[PDB]
RNA sequence: AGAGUGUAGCUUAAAAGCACCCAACUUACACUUAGGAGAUUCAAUUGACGCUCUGA
């Protein structure tokens, strides 16, 4: 029974008449656009860092795999046999303060 | 690299103010939650 | 025409595709469509990380079928020490991941555990649910 | 081709505290906060505050303040934990509570006879014993603790070779969930290291490639 | 009086013109060709023309101004510009159309006078 | 009866099974440009075309 | 120490075209629109600075 929460509340539709004003200035908009440019460049650099890291660690994994192939095949069998420990994969993100 | 998912804007058009309240579970840690009636400390028993 | 050497030159249905278990064979390994549940008390951060994992899977060539969600589970819990109310709005972004190998799945799990956001819980499991 | 059998395990510990931000990202956060200010509608607290202020103005012509005050009082009386547990001590490189914003790598010093080598903890896998089980019993033996930790899969991560008869070094990935450590002041010089601490401490190009495939973030 | 190629009804674009204005909005460059029906390009305006490369919406407009001068140069006064609906609605293309119209070129074309 | 083609038939380099892994145009203009290139190609069959139809200066440019 | 060597990520390009990321339409992806970032590694067809592989 899928009950999504995308519906706009009729209470808000009635009492949505309190702050209808939006005012911006020339210098504020210029700083908005320039900071958008710098942030776009920064996220591009961070994405390129992510790409370099993933290709580096994929390269390390594939060279590990090919060295394992040239030394032994049954280790490849048991290694490509994936573990059932991944089935209840339940982990939690970082916090703000230690306990 | 958690700041990408921790930094976002609300894409919808009709919503209330977002208050950075600090939820404290009994584990002894704080977390930034969006809750109305902005109590700064929000403790769980 | 059919007897002419330009037969079949206008074929397109052979180019267009238009018409679950988990296999462990021994040399090709492929999990079924597995659910990630992004449990968060912050809807904006949950949506942002759902979009992050969506574009990560699309860029790393994983077909993403569904990106649905299950909403708020308030629990009416008292602030026992006076009486104080506390409503709870948790939301879980449930996204399907289809294509996984051993090493590539390890890569993807390493990436998401490195990119775990603030106060957001991941839940990787199977599709045996009733939404 | 006599292949000497030698394995290892590259152990990780996931971060706890959030990464401190840069001024540019804090400025972007302020910009998004301004977006939220100018886009939000019908904030319950501020709207009822303005309503009660105008109503008391009318009543004196013809609560939000104390609630904000007690919010401030509980903010001040709530003690916060130590966010940085690194620069307050600056010396204990051994403890598990060393650093919390980035992950840590287990690393150890012990001395052999022929070589005096700084080693990410090795293992001696048997031909019949799998490398997963070798890693489990190796973590059980040389760390003498109770680590309950997740192993991602049987798929390996890093293999390197040295020829003298030759041997190899084999590296997995594993992150800790709960750690019970006993007799931290032990003999085997084990340090939990950062990426730059790795790049400082590591002697060989083998551990340089280890520093390559360890996540930098 | 000359025949326009008045077929091709199920296929985009129409080949009913004497002179088509075609715009190529590629990466780092905006190209603007003015070609006869028979494929043969008549007048070109590139931003990779290594002269206008000095001094993007404004780049598109400048290509429009140089192209309008070159069309008056070559004695071409009427086009059939035909955009896909989205670059019809796009901002830089409206500026390009306006630039050519007050550069001296009409982006319609007279009907063929039969009889 | 049939007849083998007198050359390379179109759409033959990408008759691989992995169409879900091939790039698969999402737009219209990109197909349109590939179609224009195909319309310019030589094409063994029968066509409408058959019937009807220094470094210092670079451095100065970069500085400018 | 030896071999392969060299246009941003990629090219039977020669300073080109595809890729990249950003704001909006999107649950979201995509498309499209506004953008922006980008390379011929240096010294006169050659040598050396840089990567890979083979070594110690």
Swiss-Prot record, chain A:
Cysteine disulfide links: none
Tissue specificity: Ubiquitous.
Subcellular location: Mitochondrion
Recorded superkingdom: Eukaryota
Signal sequence, renumbered to the chain: none
Subunit structure: Component of the mitochondrial large ribosomal subunit (mt-LSU). Mature mammalian 55S mitochondrial ribosomes consist of a small (28S) and a large (39S) subunit. The 28S small subunit contains a 12S ribosomal RNA (12S mt-rRNA) and 30 different proteins. The 39S large subunit contains a 16S rRNA (16S mt-rRNA), a copy of mitochondrial valine transfer RNA (mt-tRNA(Val)), which plays an integral structural role, and 52 different proteins. mL40 binds to the major groove of the anticodon stem of mt-tRNA(Val) in the central protuberance.
Family statement drawn from the similarity comment of this UniProt entry: Belongs to the mitochondrion-specific ribosomal protein mL40 family.
Protein name, UniProt field: Large ribosomal subunit protein mL40
Gene: MRPL40
Whole sequence portion shown: 83 to 181 of 206
Curated annotation (Swiss-Prot), chain B:
Location of the protein in the cell: Mitochondrion
Name by which UniProt lists this protein: Large ribosomal subunit protein mL55
Self-association and partners: Component of the mitochondrial large ribosomal subunit (mt-LSU). Mature mammalian 55S mitochondrial ribosomes consist of a small (28S) and a large (39S) subunit. The 28S small subunit contains a 12S ribosomal RNA (12S mt-rRNA) and 30 different proteins. The 39S large subunit contains a 16S rRNA (16S mt-rRNA), a copy of mitochondrial valine transfer RNA (mt-tRNA(Val)), which plays an integral structural role, and 52 different proteins.
Superkingdom assignment: Eukaryota
Residues of the full protein shown: 34 to 78 of 128
Family classification: Belongs to the mitochondrion-specific ribosomal protein mL55 family.
UniProtKB/Swiss-Prot annotation, chain C:
Any GO BP: mitochondrial translation
Keyword hit for Nucleotide-binding: no
GO cellular component: mitochondrial inner membrane; mitochondrial large ribosomal subunit; mitochondrial ribosome; mitochondrion
Keyword Transit peptide (UniProt): yes
Membrane-crossing residue ranges in chain numbering: none
Subcellular location: Mitochondrion
Recorded family membership: Belongs to the mitochondrion-specific ribosomal protein mL48 family.
Name this protein carries in UniProt: Large ribosomal subunit protein mL48
Range within the parent protein: 48 to 193 of 212
From Swiss-Prot, chain D:
GO molecular function: structural constituent of ribosome
Keywords from the UniProt entry: Acetylation, Mitochondrion, Ribonucleoprotein, Ribosomal protein, Transit peptide
GO cellular component, as recorded: cell junction; cytosol; mitochondrial inner membrane; mitochondrial large ribosomal subunit; mitochondrion; nucleoplasm
Protein localization: Mitochondrion
Keyword Mitochondrion part of the UniProt annotation: yes
Example GO BP: mitochondrial translation
Residues annotated with N6-acetyllysine modification: 168
Assembly: Component of the mitochondrial large ribosomal subunit (mt-LSU). Mature mammalian 55S mitochondrial ribosomes consist of a small (28S) and a large (39S) subunit. The 28S small subunit contains a 12S ribosomal RNA (12S mt-rRNA) and 30 different proteins. The 39S large subunit contains a 16S rRNA (16S mt-rRNA), a copy of mitochondrial valine transfer RNA (mt-tRNA(Val)), which plays an integral structural role, and 52 different proteins. mL46 is located at the central protuberance.
Family of the protein in this entry: Belongs to the mitochondrion-specific ribosomal protein mL46 family.
Protein name per UniProt: Large ribosomal subunit protein mL46
Gene behind the chain: MRPL46
Entire protein: shown range: 43 to 279 of 279
């Amino acid at each position: 029974i899928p009950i999504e929460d995308f519906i706009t509340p009729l209470k808000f539709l009635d009492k949505a008449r309190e702050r209808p004003q939006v005012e911006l200035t020339f210098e504020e908009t210029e700083r908005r656009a320039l900071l958008l440019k710098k942030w776009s460049l920064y996220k591009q650099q961070e994405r390129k860092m992510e790409r370099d890291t993933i290709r580096a660690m994929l390269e390390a994994q594939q060279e590990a795999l090919e060295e394992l192939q040239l030394e032994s095949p049954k280790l490849h069998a048991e290694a490509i046999k994936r573990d059932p420990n991944l089935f209840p994969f339940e982990k939690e993100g970082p916090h703000y303060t230690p306990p | 690299d958690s700041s990408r998912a921790s930094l976002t804007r609300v894409h919808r058009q009709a919503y209330a103010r977002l208050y950075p309240v600090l939820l404290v579970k009994q584990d002894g840690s704080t977390i930034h939650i969006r809750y109305r009636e902005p109590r700064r400390m929000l403790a769980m028993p | 025409y059919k007897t002419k050497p330009t037969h079949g030159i206008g074929k397109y249905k052979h180019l267009i595709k238009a018409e679950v278990r988990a296999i462990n064979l021994g040399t090709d390994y492929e999990y079924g469509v597995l659910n990630i549940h992004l449990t968060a008390y912050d809807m904006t951060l949950a949506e942002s990380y759902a979009q992050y994992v969506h574009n990560l899977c699309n860029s790393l060539s994983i077909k993403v079928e569904e990106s649905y969600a299950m909403p708020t589970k308030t629990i009416e819990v008292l602030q026992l020490q006076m009486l104080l109310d506390s409503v709870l709005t948790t939301h879980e972004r449930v996204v399907q991941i289809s294509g996984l190998s051993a090493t590539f799945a390890e890569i993807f799990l390493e990436i998401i555990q490195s990119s775990l956001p603030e106060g957001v819980r991941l839940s990787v499991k199977e599709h045996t649910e009733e939404d | 081709s006599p292949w000497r059998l030698l394995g290892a395990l590259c152990l990780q510990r996931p971060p706890v505290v959030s990464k401190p931000l840069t001024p540019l990202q804090e400025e972007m956060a302020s910009l998004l906060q301004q977006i939220e200010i100018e886009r939000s509608l019908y904030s319950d607290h501020e709207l009822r505050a303005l309503d009660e202020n105008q109503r008391l103005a009318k009543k004196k012509a013809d609560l939000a303040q104390d609630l904000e005050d007690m919010w401030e009082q509980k903010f001040l009386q709530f003690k916060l934990g130590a966010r940085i547990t690194e620069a307050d001590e600056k010396n204990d490189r051994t403890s598990l509570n060393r650093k919390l914003d980035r992950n840590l790598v287990l690393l150890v010093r012990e001395k052999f006879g022929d070589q005096d080598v700084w080693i990410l903890p090795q293992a001696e896998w048997q031909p019949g014993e799998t490398l997963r089980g070798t890693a489990e019993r190796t973590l059980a033996t040389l760390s003498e603790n109770n680590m309950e930790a997740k192993f991602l899969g049987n798929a390996p991560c890093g293999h390197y070779t040295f020829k003298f008869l030759g041997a190899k070094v084999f590296f997995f990935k594993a992150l800790l969930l709960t750690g019970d450590f006993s007799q931290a002041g032990n003999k085997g010089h084990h340090v939990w290291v950062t990426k730059d601490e790795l790049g400082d401490y590591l002697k060989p190009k083998y551990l340089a490639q280890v520093r390559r495939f360890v996540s930098d973030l | 009086v000359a025949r326009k190629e008045r077929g091709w009804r199920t296929v985009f674009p129409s080949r009913e013109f004497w002179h088509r204005l075609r715009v190529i909005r590629t990466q780092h460059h905006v190209e603007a060709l003015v070609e006869h029906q028979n494929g043969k390009v008549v007048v070109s305006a590139s931003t990779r023309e290594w002269a206008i490369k000095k001094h993007n919406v404004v780049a598109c407009e400048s290509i429009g101004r140089v192209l309008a001068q070159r069309c008056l140069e070559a004695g071409i006064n009427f086009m059939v510009y035909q955009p896909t609906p989205w670059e019809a609605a796009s901002d830089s293309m409206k500026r390009l159309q306006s630039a050519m119209t007050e550069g001296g070129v009409v982006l319609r074309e007279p009907q063929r006078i039969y009889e | 009866r049939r007849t083998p083609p007198l050359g390379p038939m179109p759409n033959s380099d990408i008759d691989l099974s992995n169409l879900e892994r091939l790039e698969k145009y999402r737009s219209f203009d990109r197909y349109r440009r590939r179609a224009e290139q195909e319309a310019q190609a030589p094409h063994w069959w029968r066509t409408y075309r058959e019937y009807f139809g220094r470094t210092q200066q670079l451095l100065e440019r970069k500085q400018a």
